[PDB]
Design a protein around this nucleic acid. Structure first.
Length: 188
RNA sequence: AUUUCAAAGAAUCAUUCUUUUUAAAAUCCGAUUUUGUUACUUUGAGUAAAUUAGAGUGUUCAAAGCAAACAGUUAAAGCAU
């Protein structure tokens, strides 16, 4: 049936809710979205809380090819439709594969840099911030010996009123995906 | 310049030392175990003694030596059948 059309693999509650919501978005076609969301198909979902214990965040995993072709083009409008439908913060990421440098794959003349840890984690940082684009990066080394990622955002999405909530949400999601402590902010 | 960052636990005085897990492929019965070359570095192996450093040992002491020690005015003791 219509769930298995867009849902990648045998499922639990939240994967089905997102898939149904996407089909609902596909069906109605009255918003300022072109060819709707029709080719988007979802790999997986996670639900995560932040520092504050309410208005949780949903991570959405997408197959790289799909993300690159379809999702990226319409991203601001699409994410807003998801926010409207499910009363939660949604964040979209592309599944990139990561390979250790000497480990040795059947394909490839040595490991491609696109498959390196550092490049992929930089790429995911672009994915999570995506309604904005990164202004500059700064890694602070505290006396503790931990490292803090001060990630500075542009200025476009400073006007919409979900700002602080989004920044905390991004920090949380970056931490669950990649084991680091980030903080996010915007210039004066 | 650049290609794998980290996270959790126990010991100990408040630091230190130690263990766990965290990508991907092949392989072995949803679980189990392999993955550039070389320098470098770690352990090791196999190394003549004398010499030399060095442990043991009151050559009268020392330089030395490679020995010695013990009980017994003459037997006890041990263990051998």
């Amino acid at each position: 049936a219509v769930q298995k059309r867009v849902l990648k693999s045998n499922p639990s509650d939240l994967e089905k809710e997102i898939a149904q919501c996407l089909l609902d978005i596909e069906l109605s076609s009255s918003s300022d979205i072109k060819t709707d969301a029709k080719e988007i198909k979802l790999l997986s979902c996670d639900l995560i809380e932040v520092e504050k214990l309410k208005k949780k965040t949903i991570l959405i995993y997408i197959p790289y090819k799909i993300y690159t072709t379809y999702v990226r083009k319409i991203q601001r409008k699409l994410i807003n439709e998801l926010e409207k439908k499910t009363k939660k913060y949604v964040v979209l990421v592309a599944k990139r594969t990561i390979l250790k440098g000497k480990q040795k794959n059947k394909s490839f003349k040595i490991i491609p840099r696109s498959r390196t840890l550092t490049s992929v984690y930089d790429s995911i940082l672009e994915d999570i911030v995506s309604p904005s684009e990164i202004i500059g990066k700064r890694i602070s080394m505290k006396a503790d010996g931990k490292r803090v990622f001060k990630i500075m955002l542009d200025s476009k999405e400073r006007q919409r009123d979900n700002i602080e909530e989004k920044l905390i949400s991004f920090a949380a999601v970056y931490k669950k995906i990649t084991r680091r402590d980030a903080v996010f902010s915007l210039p004066p």
